[PDB]
Structure 1
Amino acid sequence: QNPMRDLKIEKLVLNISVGESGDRLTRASKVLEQLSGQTPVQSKARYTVRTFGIRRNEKIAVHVTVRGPKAEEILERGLKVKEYQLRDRNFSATGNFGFGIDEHIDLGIKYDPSIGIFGMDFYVVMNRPGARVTRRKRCKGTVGNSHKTTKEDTVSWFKQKYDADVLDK
């Protein structure tokens, strides 16, 4: 039909939320470094809540974005514990999806002291080639309705790749 209209992974964002600031953040930073091979950024607190122990501007989370073949490798090793199967939910209206895990330190690499055990959050941003047309500075436009991504297109791509299946529930 059309070769390049096929979907591809754009970016995975590897999200983690930490209540406080301290050594937990430091080990949270470095576990993501040994996770992705690139340093993460400390997403900074936005407001005060008085119930989550949050003042404004206290850097209460860690995330990192992975793209390219390293993204293909890192989602595979992340979805293996997910078992290449996933709930019929979790798929956004744009077809992006995500889910959470409970540990990474000894999931794929050897565990070492003074790092703790952290659950965290995956989120995959998947869009077909041509995404620059809505991100470039000059001649910025949109993406046509056909070029958009939907649930059925994404879940179908989820099938043919990894031979995965949805709706394990």
Structure 2
Amino acid sequence: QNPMRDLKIEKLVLNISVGESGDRLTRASKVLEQLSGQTPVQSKARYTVRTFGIRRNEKIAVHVTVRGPKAEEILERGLKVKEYQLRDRNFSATGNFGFGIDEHIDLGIKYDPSIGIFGMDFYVVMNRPGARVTRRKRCKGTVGNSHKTTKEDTVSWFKQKYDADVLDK
């Protein structure tokens, strides 16, 4: 049935890939500080691409992991600026979903003329309660087949909550 396996939000990840180093990346980190209320972590390149203008071991992106009530309020603000419609793709086959916003002034803080415009990627993952069995150290395991939330379960939950709608497929 459904005693306690209903669903829950595990974490929300805010990702900004500025593609260069310096003032732009630092200002993106300040945007993440002011939005999440939490120190952002700067992600680093993997290999050089000539067309991308990136170099190996050069700081490229920045991301924040948030959990709990702050995760749900950030998700609510993101869905509010995304007018509660999400394109079905937008719900990956392992149930985790996400979207992307441009011109982050649409939610929250004013422009702060010294930082700039930074679009960001919202990515959210969900789990049924009991993912500690595959995350903990001693006596690891894998969740069973009446678990590991699917696309249909996620879209059913996302149509039950939030009063949202989906697209064609």
Question: Can you list the C-alpha shifts for 1:50-69, whole angstroms capped at 9, x where unaligned?
Answer: 11111101110011111101
Unaligned runs of 5+ in 1: none
1:168 CA displacement: 6.8
Deviations 1:32-67 (A, max 9, x none): 111100011111001111111111011100111111
Rounded Cα–Cα distance in structure 2 between residues aligned with 1:13 and 1:32: 11
Question: For residues 115 and 168 of structure 1, do their structure 2 counterparts lie closer, same or farther at Cα, with a shift above 3 Å needed?
Answer: farther
Supply the distance in 2 between the matched residues of 1:32 and 1:71 (Cα, whole angstroms). 13
Q: Alpha-carbon deviation of 1:75? A: 0.2
Q: 1:127 deviation in Å?
A: 1.1
CA distance in 2, matches of 1:142, 1:120: 32
Structure 1-normalised TM-score? 0.95
Q: Which residue of 2 aligns with 1:161?
A: 161
Residue pair 2:81, 2:106 contacting (<8 A) in 1 also: no
In structure 2, runs of 5+ residues without a counterpart are none
User: Does structure 1 retain, via aligned residues, the 8 Å contact 2:16–2:61?
Assistant: yes
Once superposed, which parts of structure 1, at least 4 consecutive aligned residues long, lie more than 3 Å away? none
How much does 1:107 deviate?
2.5
Compared CA separation, residues 61 and 25, structure 1 to 2 (3 A)? same
With over 3 angstroms needed to count, the CA separation of the structure-2 counterparts of 1:23 and 1:105, relative to structure 1, is: farther
Change (3 A) 1:168 1:112: farther
Deviation digits for residues 64-105 of structure 1, max 9, x if unmatched? 111101101110011101111211111111111111100224
1:113, CA displacement in angstroms? 1.5
Structure 2 counterpart SS, 1:60: strand
Find the aligned partners of 1:35 and 1:68 in 2 and give their Cα distance. Answer: 15
In the TM superposition, what is the alpha-carbon distance from 1:5 to its structure 2 partner? 0.6
Deviation at 1:3, TM superposition (A): 3.0
Q: Distance in 1 between matches of 2:162 and 2:7?
A: 14
Inter-partner Cα distance in structure 2 for 1:122 and 1:168: 22
Assess, with a 3 A threshold, how the Cα gap between structure 1 residues 168 and 15 changes in structure 2: closer, same or farther: farther
Tell me the distance in 2 between the aligned counterparts of 1:51 and 1:59.
17
CA contact (8 A) 1:86 1:168 kept: no
Query: What is the percentage of aligned positions where both structures have the same residue?
Result: 100
The alignment's TM-score, normalised by the length of structure 2, stands at 0.95
